[model samples]
Target: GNNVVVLGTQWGDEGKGKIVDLLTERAKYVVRYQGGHNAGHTLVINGEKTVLHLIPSGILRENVTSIIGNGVVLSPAALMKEMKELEDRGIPVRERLLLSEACPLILDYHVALDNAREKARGAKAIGTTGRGIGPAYEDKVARRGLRVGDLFDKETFAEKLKEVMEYHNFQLVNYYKAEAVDYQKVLDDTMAVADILTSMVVDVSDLLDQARQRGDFVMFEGAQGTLLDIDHGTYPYVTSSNTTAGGVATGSGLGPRYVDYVLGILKAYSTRVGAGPFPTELFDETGEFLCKQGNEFGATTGRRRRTGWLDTVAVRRAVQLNSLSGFCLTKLDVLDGLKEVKLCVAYRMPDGREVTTTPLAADDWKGVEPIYETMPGWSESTFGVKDRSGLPQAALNYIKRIEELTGVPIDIISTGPDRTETMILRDPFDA
Candidate 1:
């Protein structure tokens, strides 16, 4: 009951870093369950900002142990870059961080394959981060991928690399028409950091189980969001890995029963990066205003995000999929000045049938119309207002309506980007 699983209920960039950092105060171990460096989590503390990619959010806390679980695809080059940034800021990154030995490595060939495939797709591109996340996962499943543990054995690692590179190079040169990566270059570059990486490697599952036995509070941090889940999300438009609560177990090597709470982080409105079927997307001035107000830019890609009204139809699907215990509503202050707010309660199909569920496939979203429920907006600023009693009546009504529509209690409300700018109705750890 001490362990809590925190994930995004909607599309990613739902202010998860701030929430996870806040929750890490009670957790001795904070584990990053899935996703690679492509997933970005920005944390602001006392007006200072830190963006994390490969490392867990708990790395900011000196007392917390940050674990990169096996579910994540590791790019040693990217990890090294991020670690250097944190170390430059005086954070003892290497001392507090641990990595799973089984995590698949993202090599240069993977990046070449990723860029070539995306270029090949052209107009049909899935808008990947071009960080080799997909290709690395593909190699893992293909059983030819190299893991962190494999680096220690230079002989076997070289042998495996030769075979895998031969296979990938043939495809890259013939099919994708991309330049092949030099085998020695990749092997030498990867082996350069082998000693450093191997020093931090451990059996993540056994360590987590031991921590659980010791009754230490652990938090399983999920990247991306529920809508980006490989299986549950929109096909072809989704990320390579699972981004739901189920991922907490598989990614972290922890048992399901060890998790006590499942907290779904939801933005007051919706914003998504890259290409996807967004039924509730706002293409008007309000969308532009929300974009500017919320600073809706991809933390990793720096691309402008597509803004829209909150869609409860998609929220319901996430609630069912994640078995979410409660919700943490973020970016409420982004909607402060609007004269009115709207929520997409259901989707009206082209056939004139109304449904509260999201479509299964990306193409199925075509011709789907959002059925909106409008509410009055508050003119007063809610930013940095931590108390619920400090909120306007209209804002309270809006929050109440979302709870009624989703059948999930709003246990926490994030008023701003800072971790201290939150109001907690009930603590996930206490629950």
Candidate 2:
């Protein structure tokens, strides 16, 4: 059985939900490896759109067991609300989704700390989703974090909650000058969440091991993107998780040897949300056009994204970091109707030397400039194009050039938002 990993190549929101749903047809188990509710995955099926934050995209398929792996930071309130929404829409959530017992909890104080920190930063804000993802991860590393298993113990949970809150409340009132979260209300609300979330909690790592022994196909879904990884990405402005192929093993307790292939989902062009240095960011009419055409808005934060050309330098770096097998190029239709399109081949550093590699330092990125390679754009609409042969020669050339520049096959071409509007040159399982 093949165990595949799927993740974004650029920043978050590269339209992974639809791709994950398409691949889930051959998978028995799908696991979310990292991040939290701050990451949004949008799925379009039969012309209906569904946005998922915490749950895996495989939940829309039949007989697929969607799992939240231990590396994720779980927000009980957010999870319950999203679960209830899907249930109300006639989706059987509890029967298909499982929560990891080892997942660190994102409680009320975490949210307070997150909001206060962002406000205090003011002009230097990291443009977080303000969903407490950072604060939760901080607590986990601090060795005093609360986990889903903690909810099962009444006396111990009370003792730990008070101890943790004492530290957070002191900072809120004294340092941040914000109101401290009330302990009784927080405890009461969390107890209610315990009753609702308890039934679905289980040892996810053990279940994944058993599933692999049974030769079941598994898909590991990563939130955010490669460049947002805390260790490898733009520093201080990055998410607090390992959004790479290496995360699949450490996050789920699955050995790296079991992974057969890794697919990097990328946009035909580049776009990023929040505050980060983008070498190819467009600030003109083309940027506005790309914005409206691609609907470049953050799925979770709702902030309008900065649009730009396809950056081969960035994607190539992602390929090396993730050891990607192939790429699923999405939103080619967004580039349609233009007379010409550009591709960023390399960066002209502040020192006037051209480099194709990602810089190791933050200041290095601030001074580099993207070097472009232009190609003719087509006027014909690429939307709803199902067959590769049906595509115009110009569009095909654009796709081919990307593969040549990035040194990775364009294994899948996503033409539209519908589930069927995709051209699969190579399936991840088959690869």
Candidate 3:
């Protein structure tokens, strides 16, 4: 009767795709909210690995309808490429996939502006995928952007493109000294993509509302993570959109009352990609080990991640903000064979105060250092582990500590990357 929102509790790459895929069996509709191709959700099924960006993870399933909601900025070229890739791999995507008519389109001018801005930032770059996500959102807010629905209307699309390119080309050519993109080229490119995209466009908000009225189950899948949220995260280092539970309503055009549960996906230890102020970042051999073991790298950008100890200080903030009903802890196997492990329980601020609260200002965050609590590491590998009783004592203690700190029950545990390697605490909620 209500929707379920699956989100990341920590930084990005919390294995949300696996969790979404696991929950999709009972869900009639799967909606992707916020972010864009910059946010990658890697899903492993059987022996094959699939990385999804800009498309809902539920595309793997047969009957489930996947909808890319309005909050997302759609890249027609990227979406078409991904669909073709899926079809080439023998995956059925065309029949079940849907796109919101209200979703904003990411134009070539956005990409040019995105590249110009990131290059201007140089060392201070926010570690973006440089896929034009930020610029697209900026255009949307500026009311100079085109929507998916505009693709079919030549005159509306032409006028919008002219207005966007006027600003985008000036910045690209004068500020960044980059090659200026032609408005005509962008119009032609988008016009070619309109036919396929229009056929998939629908009133997703209405569809989901009707589904809710019929008591059909819907799952809201958020891209990126809480710590990457622009408003609530670590300032300018964050993504362009909200990645919390509230985004489910804003992004999907659904009422808050429609959401029944929020599942926060977390990793056993902490890891972050690109540039940011990370209080619990590791700098020793252990950090190196975790990076190597977990293959900690950005799925979309291919950049190596900054490894760190589990920061309950950050996780606790996410839990409070999202009001998580449960958590799905992933990558527990990466901690095996270590003699010692650490958890960042709190932070020591510049004023010499022991702060357990999440920092609001960038200057305050940068001055804080993590206060860690050490624990014995488990020598036993939990990979392929299916039962709770089969878990190591140390592993059990680690999970218990997380629950105690965050006040959210661990309902699922991912021992490995494969879909079958997951341990579900209970039968997935049946709609």
Candidate 4:
């Protein structure tokens, strides 16, 4: 009767895919509950790299049903491309994956609108992946969007697409001064992809309910991380969707009380993908050293991620926000050769206020200085050490300090990028 929610605690890229893949051994089902094709997870298995955008990480395993929950916005082109790529590799995705019928569709006009809005914003634009994720979510909330089910009915789909495009096209031409998207072209392209989508469409809520009824384990996978959440994160610079633990319930058709475990996937060091308030940012050679060692780059956007020390203030917020029961620490091995490391303990605000939590808004972080405590860095190699006793005393001390600072136990530690390179103190599924 237990279900697990595995999600990122920082600005994403927390190596959730590999963890989810590892834990899928105990789960009967894996569900992707939020975000869109903009979410990218890189998995390195047997020296081959596989980047998944919209599918659950459990798709690679046998007997596990992977679902795209209604919280996700689907892009026909991107979805098909991902599906075809897996098919080409003979992954048997179609038999294992299911698509939610209620998902909002990302069409050509949304992409056009996304590009136009960013271009219009100039310097003030929020750093987006330019993948139409925000615009699709906007349409869904406005009740003016086309859904996966709408595409099956060609006439209804065409009518709805026309009305939406007309409004979007006016803004494109009159405001953004961008080229108008062709209604017929978009419609034809959408219909061309309809068959494949329709084949996979199913009622995910009912299936999940059935799984629970049958007393099977289900895993709710969240895209992005808690700090990128629209309501809690730095305003305007945040992602368009909710990234906190509360999202899994609203995003999926499940209630929070049903969740037995909440495992927060965290990196040993912090990194950010898009523009946002980063208190512990490292600008010098240590930052470059961390980047080169960890290959800190975005899987989806291919942009170089901003690296920094662990911010315990933000982490403390995450522990409370997600109600994090335990933390699965990833990328700890990346700091192997460094002579020393820093962890942000608190923030000194402009008003002489020393706080241990992220500010309610972005502007409050302007003059706030990060308060960090230096910890001894070990020179011993930690990569792929399967036993906890094999870890250096300094490394163990660092983990214990992190747990003490954040008030959450480090239950799992990822020693490398591969799935087997891990040490699990407690299994979220069985705990």
Error of 2 at 95 (Å): 0.9
The candidate maximizing TM-score is: 1
Any residue pairs clashing in model 4, and if so which? Answer: none
RMSD of each: 0.9, 1.1, 1.3, 1.1
Q: Could you tell me which residue pairs clash in candidate 3? A: none
Off by over 4 Å in 3: 427-431
Pairs that clash in candidate 1: none
Residue-wise C-alpha lDDT for candidate 3, range 1-431, written one tens digit per residue = 35788899888898998889888888889999899898888888886899999889999998799999999999998998899999998876778898887788987778788888887899998888889999999888888788898877878778978877888888788878899999888888878878889999888888888998888889889898898888898888888898888888888888888888888999988888878888988889989999999989898999899898889999989998897888899999999999988899998988899989888645558789889888889888799897878799999999998888877889889888888898888543632
Per-model TM values vs. the true structure:
0.99, 0.98, 0.97, 0.98
Which residue runs of candidate 4 sit more than 4 Å off their true CA positions? none
- Model 1: which ten-residue window has the lowest total lDDT? 355-364
lDDT of residue 97 for candidate 2: 91
By TM-score, the better pick of 1 and 4 is: 1
Highest-scoring model, lDDT: 1
lDDT score, residue 40, model 2? 87
Candidate 2 per-residue lDDT over residues 275-316, each given as its tens digit: 787899999999999999999998888999989888999899
State model 2's lDDT: 0.89
The 10-residue segment with the lowest total lDDT in model 3: 422-431
Instruction: Point out the worst 10-residue segment of candidate 4 by lDDT.
Output: 356-365
